[PDB]
């Protein structure tokens, strides 16, 4: 009577296959649950809120802050001192002065902030001006104390520079992270400014900069996990249901073979 | 006779667990169906088709367009006017002249397009030359009218610049998007050209540029969704099958306990 | 007796639905198995091992290699020749001399390697100095022959340049790929150095460079496939179990309708 030994063999092979599938599903779901996957989405926005460009001039002085639309850069009429157009907020924080310039809105009309500095430097030998871009300009002027908020952004918001003698076309764009947080990233483009001034007044450098928006989109980053635990739990129920089914079918076939 | 109340309790708990799994699977599949995932693939290509580099010189004049292999840049023999080598297509579109230069093929042999401009500028004060790279040069010369095709690429294809006085080593690479579309992206590298000319003829700037391919690969972008709706529908069938099974086993156990 | 024709019709529709689900699950799992998905993870590291910056000066000579902490760049006391501080390894490979400079550790203290070159160039007309960053400096000095290891890194590790007359603030960061491999990527920032030297000794250029770490993180890249084959095999078992179940329920309902 070797029929019950063969029935125990096919039941042992069926529970071995069910235990192998139950190990492999839990191992694969834990492996896809360990490493998350970033998912990108481009939300279109027709008009941005006006950001703040917190420039840090050491001894430089702002000479222009004129907005220009539709990529129309005119020739500058003189490298002396004209009057500003945009609203500047000169504030002194300590964690240094931060000449905050209100940035551009209206991305579809291509608005830029052409600005121009000048510095007769004598102590430093690397002509740079740092800056830092935060998300909203009205949050600065609608604050009860500006030196708390600019201090707070001097720890988290990152600082780039531009050079002395070059127009630095800065094209910024937003990135929103979920999981909320909103940060900037820019791409400079250096173009040499040829001096056609007399050589008596060429001791002072000139710092041009163009800040515009790149494209009317906001990149959205969501951290997503590609493992499904509830589905995996169900899949284990469908395995543990067929481990009973195939054992009952083998118990029927083991008696039907000697009928 | 409180046995039917306990059978209705275990059947209510089983259909509550089945309704909870049927809500959670549909919610998880809709959440993973909302946010897609970009998938990158690097198709290797041994030889690229020759692209077109649509330069926009304002008043500059091309002085060289010589190909060089194996990263061999020779010294330029004179900053005057030699003769060109590559094929230029001077065409006038309006949406400006677009001196289209046929780009490099043979990425494994490291072919580049060394070019040199010159401009005695008097009206502008930012020495830049814009350019724009489209995917195939033979599509321009095999067109019935070139001002339709260049006008079409002046809306979609993006424009970078290079400066006056610097060699701008542009290393381009393709990106193909699926979901078809093919676009470029480049990374410049500015190196200062020191003038060793007499100072009588230093009124005109010099614009050097090097266009080569970066690596023999084409990055392929496919938008992929990590949710499986057919599998989810099946998983719901396996849940709604075990909601009957466990209720039948509870109906057997409720009568077997008082046997 | 048209009841068996209707039972064969509902059994044919049930095996058609089961064959459609069994085709669609295998097609969706093969489609999500064809295209893999890159997964990013940022492992924090409090202190990096010191890398090697394999500069290639043609005829330039190193004049300083001083470390500075906490973004404190002092004024350089003279553009002549001071003495070095960091350890340089001048070695001659051929696949050229490779003046290997030991890079910075201690990312949280913001350590940089300020260096300064000088070259009275007469044969070349593009003032550039190439470099190349490998992962560990002690692997070079703890090698039995340095010209094998530098040869081997001259094929795989990529080469950037910096210019003559500009401070090039290089901010490097690691990327580790799995599937092991470790590579660098940097982002330069060019700032013009204004010469305040007498014009008799301005025939030689000056090459400044700053090498620091960007942020205390190591980006980890794992290639992950979003398809689950074992789960798909199970899902097929749950489909092929319900194809029997619904056929048995239709066989019960076809006799219960004429009871």
Residue C136 is part of a domain; what is its CATH number?
A: 2.60.470
- Cα separation, B41 vs C35, in Å, equals 7
Same structural domain, B12 and B122: no
> Across the interface, which of C39, C76, C189 has its CB nearest the CB of A35?
C39
Give me the resolution in angstroms, 1 decimal: 3.5
Experimental method: cryo-EM
* Reduced DSSP (H G I as helix, E B as strand, rest coil) percent helix, strand, coil of chain A, to 5: 30, 35, 35
In a domain, B128, yes or no: yes
Query: Listing from the earlier edge strand, what are the strands of the sheet with A133-134?
Result: A88-92, A97-102, A52-55, A133-134
Does B131 reside within a domain? yes
Nearest to C190 among A123, A190, A232 (CB): A190
Q: Does residue B41 lie within any of the structural domains?
A: no
| Contact assessment for residue A113 and residue A67, using Cβ atoms and an 8 Å cutoff | yes
Distance from CA of A106 to the nearest CA of C (A): 29
d(CA C17, CA C21): 6
C235–A125 C-beta distance less than 8 A: no
CB contact under 8 A, B75 and C121: no
| Closest chain A CA to residue C226 | A226
Residue C50 has what DSSP assignment? P
Calpha distance B126→A208 (Å, rounded): 10
Looking at the fold, whether A192 and A144 belong to one and the same domain comes out as yes
Whether residues C237 and A232 touch (CB distance < 8 A) is answered with no
Chain-chain contact of C191 with A128 (C-beta, under 8 angstroms): yes
One domain, residues A131 and A173: yes
Residue of C nearest to A245 (CA): C241
Question: C213 and C234: one domain?
Answer: no
Q: Are C192 and A160 inside 8 Å of each other by CB?
A: no
Residues of A in contact with B131 (CB under 8 A): none
The two tokens of residue B24 are 């959670």
User: Are residues A148 and A58 located together in one domain of the fold?
Assistant: yes
Q: Tell me if residue A176 falls in helix, strand or coil.
A: strand
Distance (Å, rounded) from C-alpha A162 to C-alpha A172?
14
Own/partner long-range contacts of B248-256 (Cβ < 8 Å, ≥24 apart): B250/B7, B250/B10, B250/B11, B250/B14, B251/B7, B254/B3, B254/B6, B254/B7, B254/B10
Helix (H) or strand (E) holding A44: strand A37-44
Q: Compute the nearest-CA separation of A230 from chain B (Å).
A: 7
CB B125 within 8 A of CB A193: yes
Measured between beta carbons, the chain B residues lying within 8 angstroms of C126 are 73, 167, 191-194
Query: Smallest Cβ distance to B242: which of A73, A75, A237?
Result: A237
Which residue segment(s) compose the domain that C27 sits in? 3-36+227-256
- C234 and C215 both lie in a single domain: no
A79 and A206 in a common domain:
yes
Distance, CA of A178 to chain centre = 11
Are A190 and B239 inside 8 Å of each other by CB? no
Rg (C-alpha) for chain C, rounded Å, is 33
Asked if residue A78 belongs to a domain, the reply is: yes
∠ CA A137-A45-A64, nearest 5°, is 40
Please name the member of C75, C190, C235 whose beta carbon is closest to the beta carbon of A163.
C190
**Residue B169 sits in the same domain as residue B183:** yes
B232 and B216 share one domain:
no
Q: Domain total for chain C?
A: 2
Of A39, A193, A230, the CB nearest to B37: A39
Q: Which two tokens stand for residue A227?
A: 């493992």
Could you tell me if residue A40 is inside a domain?
A: no
Do residue B203 and residue B231 come from a single domain? Answer: no
A226 vs A221: CA distance, rounded Å? 15
- Same domain? For A115 and A164 the reply is yes
Same domain for B180 and B154: yes
Task: Mutate one of C35, C166, C222 to test the B interface: name it (highest B CB count within 10 A).
Answer: C35
Cα separation, C161 vs C8, in Å, equals 76
């Amino acid at each position: 009577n070797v029929f019950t030994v063969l029935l125990i063999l096919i039941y042992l092979l069926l529970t071995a296959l069910a235990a192998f599938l139950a190990y492999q599903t839990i191992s694969e779901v834990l492996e896809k649950l360990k490493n998350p996957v970033m998912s990108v989405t481009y939300q279109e926005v027709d008009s941005f809120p006006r950001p703040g460009i917190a420039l840090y001039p050491g001894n430089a002085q702002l000479l222009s802050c004129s907005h220009y639309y539709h990529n129309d850069i005119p020739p500058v009429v003189e490298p002396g001192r004209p009057q500003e157009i945009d609203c500047v907020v000169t504030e002194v924080t300590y964690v240094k002065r931060a000449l905050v310039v209100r940035g551009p809105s209206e991305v579809r009309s291509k608005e830029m902030v052409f600005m121009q500095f000048s510095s007769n430097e004598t102590g430093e030998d690397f002509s740079a001006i740092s800056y830092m871009i935060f998300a909203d300009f009205t949050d600065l002027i609608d604050s009860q104390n500006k030196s708390r908020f600019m201090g707070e952004c001097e720890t988290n918001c990152s600082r780039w520079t531009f050079s002395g003698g070059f127009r630095t076309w800065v094209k910024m764009s937003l990135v929103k992270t979920f999981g909320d947080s909103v940060e900037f990233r820019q791409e400079s483009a250096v173009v040499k400014f040829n001096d056609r001034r007399p050589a008596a007044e060429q001791i002072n450098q000139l710092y041009f900069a163009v800040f515009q928006w790149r494209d009317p989109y906001i990149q959205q980053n969501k951290m997503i996990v590609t493992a499904n635990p509830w589905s995996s739990i169900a899949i284990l129920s469908g395995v543990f249901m067929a481990l009973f089914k195939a054992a009952n079918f083998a118990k029927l076939t083991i008696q039907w073979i000697i009928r």
